[PDB]
Amino acid sequence: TIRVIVSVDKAKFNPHEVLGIGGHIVYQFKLIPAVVVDVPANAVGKLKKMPGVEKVEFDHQAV
C-alpha cells in the first residue's frame, strides 16, 4: 500500500467507492476538499480516473 492525498470534487466523489480499486479512506479533511487514502501501489492510475478525483498527490516525510 501507498498513502496519497486526493483533491476531490465533493459533488462527484464518493469516499465509500475507493474500495472499488482496493482502497480505503484514512482521513477526510474538514477545511479543504481533500482526503487521505491508502491504495495498492498499482491502483494510482485507476484512482486518477475515479469520479470526483481532481488530483492525486503523494505523501512525503519531513524532518
Binding site: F29, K30, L31, I32, E57, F58, A62, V63
Partner: protein
C-alpha cells in the same frame, strides 16, 4: 530535583523579559499551537501552560495521553522555548504564560509525514471543540468565542511542495493565524516547505556571536537564536540543542506577545501581514521593522529582516 531558574541567552537576545511586565502571553483568547513530536505534559516547568494535547500520527486524531506524549524530546524542547514557566526552577520561555496546544505530528524519530502535518494544521484551526468558526462571523483567530490558536509553530520542513499542504496553510492564514516555520538545516540557498510559502514566516538560526549558523537554510524571513539553546527536555529535565527547530519557537513566542499585548490593549488581534510587509499595521510588518538589522541593510539572504525583538515589536504594536 529541579535546578533553579535560568534565562537562556536566546530569550535575553530576542528581548522578551522586558515585555513580561505588560504581558507574559497569558491573555485568555491567545493560544500557540506547536506542531511537533508531542510534549512532556507533566514537566513541572511546562504543565500549567498545556491547554490541549492532540495527536495526528498516521492520520488518526487522538486526544489520548499515550498518543500525545513526547517520545522524542524535540517538541518538549521547542515548547519550553515558547512557554517554560517564569517561576523558581528550570528555564523560561519567550511568552512564559501563554497557553499551548501541543499537536503531535512527528513520531518518536522527529520525523513526520505531510499528511499528518496538514491534519495538524486543521486541528490547530478547529481547536478542541472541533469547529473552526462556531458563531459563523468570519473571525477565528482572536475571536474569544472560538478556540483556534493565533499562532502555528512548525519546527519541521521538507523539500516537497503540494497543494493539499499549501491549501491547509491558506486555511490557517485566512483564519487570521500567524504561521511560523524553520527555514531548514541543509545549509541550502532557500527554505524548506512550509517555511517557503508566502503565508509562512521562514525562520533562520543565529549563534551567540550573532553569526548566521552554517546549517541554516538561507533566504529566511527573520532569524532567531538557534545554536546552544538550553530548554526543557524529557523526562522532567533540560537539554541544550541547535537547529532552526530552536530558532522557530523564539519567533512564535514573540508573535504571541504581540497578539497578546495588542488584544489586552484593544480587544482584537493584529492582521498577519505579508512576507514583504514594512508597515506597523500587521504582525509581520512590525516583526520586520523592529528586527535587529544584521549584515547588509534591509532584508538579506542570511538573516532575512534581522533578529526578532519582542520588546520593540510590542512597543511598536501598542504605539
Amino acid at each position: 530535583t529541579q535546578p533553579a531558574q535560568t534565562i537562556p541567552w536566546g530569550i535575553e537576545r530576542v528581548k522578551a523579559p522586558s515585555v513580561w511586565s505588560i504581558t507574559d502571553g497569558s491573555v485568555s483568547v491567545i493560544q500557540v499551537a506547536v506542531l511537533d513530536t508531542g510534549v512532556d505534559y507533566d514537566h513541572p516547568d511546562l504543565a500549567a501552560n498545556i491547554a490541549w494535547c492532540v495527536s495526528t500520527l498516521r492520520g488518526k486524531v487522538s486526544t489520548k495521553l499515550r498518543d500525545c506524549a513526547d517520545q522524542n524530546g524535540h517538541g518538549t524542547h521547542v515548547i519550553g522555548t515558547i512557554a517554560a514557566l517564569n517561576n523558581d526552577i528550570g528555564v523560561v520561555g519567550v511568552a512564559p504564560g501563554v497557553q499551548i496546544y501541543s499537536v503531535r505530528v512527528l513520531d518518536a524519530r522527529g520525523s513526520g509525514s505531510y499528511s499528518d502535518i496538514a491534519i495538524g494544521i486543521e486541528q490547530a484551526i478547529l481547536g478542541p471543540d472541533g469547529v473552526a468558526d462556531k458563531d459563523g462571523d468570519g473571525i477565528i483567530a482572536g475571536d474569544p468565542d472560538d478556540d483556534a490558536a493565533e499562532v502555528i509553530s512548525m519546527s519541521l520542513g521538507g523539500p516537497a511542495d503540494d497543494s493539499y499542504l499549501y491549501d491547509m496553510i491558506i486555511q490557517a492564514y485566512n483564519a487570521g493565524i500567524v504561521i511560523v516555520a524553520a527555514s531548514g538545516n541543509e545549509g541550502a540557498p532557500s527554505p524548506s516547505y512550509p517555511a517557503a510559502y508566502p503565508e509562512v514566516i521562514a525562520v533562520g538560526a543565529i549563534d551567540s556571536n550573532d553569526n548566521i549558523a552554517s546549517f541554516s537554510n538561507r533566504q529566511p524571513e527573520v532569524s532567531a537564536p538557534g545554536v546552544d539553546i538550553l530548554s526543557t527536555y524529557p523526562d522532567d529535565s533540560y537539554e541544550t540543542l541547535m537547529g532552526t527547530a530552536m530558532a522557530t519557537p523564539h519567533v512564535s513566542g514573540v508573535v504571541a506577545l504581540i497578539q497578546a499585548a495588542y488584544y489586552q490593549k484593544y480587544g482584537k488581534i493584529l492582521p498577519v501581514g505579508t512576507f514583504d510587509d514594512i508597515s506597523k499595521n500587521t504582525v509581520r510588518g512590525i516583526l520586520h521593522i523592529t528586527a535587529d538589522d544584521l549584515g547588509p541593510t534591509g532584508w538579506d539572504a542570511d538573516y532575512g529582516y534581522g533578529v526578532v525583538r519582542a520588546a520593540l515589536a510590542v512597543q511598536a504594536a501598542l504605539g
